[model samples]
Target: DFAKLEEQFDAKLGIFALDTGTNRTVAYRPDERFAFASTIKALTVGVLLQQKSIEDLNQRITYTRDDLVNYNPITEKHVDTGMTLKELADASLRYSDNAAQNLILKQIGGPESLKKELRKIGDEVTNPERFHPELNEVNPGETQDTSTARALVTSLRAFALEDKLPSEKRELLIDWMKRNTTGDALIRAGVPDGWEVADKTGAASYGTRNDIAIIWPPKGDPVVLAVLSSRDKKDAKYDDKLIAEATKVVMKALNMN
Candidate 1:
């Protein structure tokens, strides 16, 4: 049954989906790893919310030209006086702002600190090596930030259901995810109408399209689904369509229309 889902893609793909009500899982290449791209920002903010507070999120933070990076909507929009931590978090998570993410990395003491935080949360597979868009420009033989579909789904499951974070903060994070306006054509496009979805998307050079989501049906259990795709540089739309097709298969497998 799952083999047909694999036939729908002509790229490197990894998928993991869980029916939380019954603890049932359907996956393809669940253990395969890929460059995480902006999706890593979710973990960055997850760590920040744990170590910092809502009050801290309100503090203003300045940005110089040094902070600018390519693919940054916030920097491109050019806010002169800088933005608050909460604003940065919103831009980072809701829109996958690259510069805002680096700023958060600076606040949290860089990539190593983020790694430490991930370890504290029991994540063993996410190795975020640096901030973006530089992460997209890795040196020869250097590893970029990477994770498996299984690892990402595991992290999202904990973020959603585990007591590691307080209920208020957890709700805050999910709210931010719900506001995400990016990647609407991927997993979000495949979900049924009126079903709520909280998700983050990642895109990189070379047809990489990724989305990790918490899908809440109007009736029945919430679903955690992660899809990662890496294809030829010019095949982005194809990759997105493939992700949507795979998402439909997963939903059907879980008995959701």
Candidate 2:
């Protein structure tokens, strides 16, 4: 279940797991980044929130069919459902809803502003233009935003430690992530049922699958884990299965109960 995954995929695999229940960790490929897919929304919201207060989060915003993007389904059909900034943010993370994210991105000054914020954090954010370009407009020249496993961990740790970001902001970021959660079955598949998990997942047409997580194992130590891959998949389930299997093997090595 552990080592067999990398052999099966014939590509690089990285794992980082922490048991909050016991405060332990397991790490592999901890610093690599895949295309980031939708998980970038998590950080996107954090940057948006930095500029707006929770009150701004409560204000309702409307979406027309005109606001939809290249990858989200939720925005196409649900244009009539008026939502607050927070509601859209929640849906973006929880459902991987691209339309909801784009709306929020526009409000937060688009992806260009986000890149500026990322630079402040010392992350090597390449091709950030993909996330920007005037909200409703997807530029033909934009490149996919790149992320590494290390940057993912650093972002999570910054949010958790509240060292760089204010304590209230950090907690707010974590809380939003918890609320808008998606892709749990991939990263949380092998953990004990009762354990708490906070994570995000991303998938792309090019066969890119990414999952970054912060886990608190029941009665164990906390660990941070991130897994990413770029593949030309014949089966859609391949990425999820690979990540789950890889996590199981890595956790076993740490002797996590």
Candidate 3:
């Protein structure tokens, strides 16, 4: 089924899902690397929350017009007004706002700072590169700003699920991810109506459509799923259905709704 899903979409799919209820796992190419796309923004914002205090987040920071790249839904409106670090984090996570991500990256001291934060969380596999807008354009076989499915899920679990991050910051990140508008077609399409899904989406040039989540089924413990997919052709379209079907495959394998 996994092969069929990948063949139909022409995407190299990597998945790692943990049914935390029973410690069951379902994966396909879970160790394969994929361009992280916008997922790194969410991770960077998480690092910001952990490394900075609430007062630091509340300080307003203004940025020049030059920082605004494409896909900046929330920040584009605030070009003249500016925003706080918390506001920037919310924009990056909830809307996948590119400029907002760059601002937050500055607060976290750029990509290597993110790598250092992840290492503290016990993940040395997530390699970040330059800025986000360009990192998503990674060429074939290039591993900058890329990570394995297992590493992503591991990082997500530590940042949002485990106790490594303070409970208050954890809730804020989850709340932002829960309201993420960009994932309506990815994991959201694959999940049932009543299930609670908090996820961050990543899509870029090279046909990447990735989503990582912590899903709470109506009656059981939460399940963590990371599905990252990409195509070789730089011009290829990012197919949302590819991720939706991959979600179904993992859910079926785990025998959960």
Query: TM-score of model 3 relative to the true fold?
Result: 0.97
- The parts of candidate 3 lying over 4 Å away from their true place are none
Model 3 alpha-carbon miss at residue 83, Å = 0.3
Off by over 4 Å in 2: 1-3, 16-27, 70-78, 125-127, 132-143, 179-181, 232-237
Candidate 1 residue-wise lDDT, 124-160, digit = tens: 8888878777675433223568788988888877866
What local lDDT score does residue 103 receive in model 1, on the 0 to 100 scale? 93
252: Cα error in model 3, Å: 1.4
Q: Which ranking of candidates, highest TM-score first?
A: 3, 1, 2
**Candidate numbers, best lDDT first, in rank order:** 3, 1, 2
Cα deviation of 39, candidate 3, in Å: 0.8
Give the C-alpha miss distance for residue 185 in model 3, angstroms.
0.9
Residue 157 C-alpha lDDT in model 1: 74
Stretches of candidate 1 off by over 4 Å are 1-8, 137-143, 232-238
lDDT of 1 at 207: 66
The better-scoring model by lDDT among 1 and 3 is 3
lDDT of 3 by residue, 1-257 (tens): 98998889888899999987799999899999898888887678778989877678898979877988877888888878889888998889988888998888877788888888889888988998778678888888888889989999988988888876798888998899998888988988888988989999998778888999989888988888999998888988978898999898888888885
TM-score to native of every candidate shown: 0.92, 0.80, 0.97
Candidate 1 colliding pairs: none
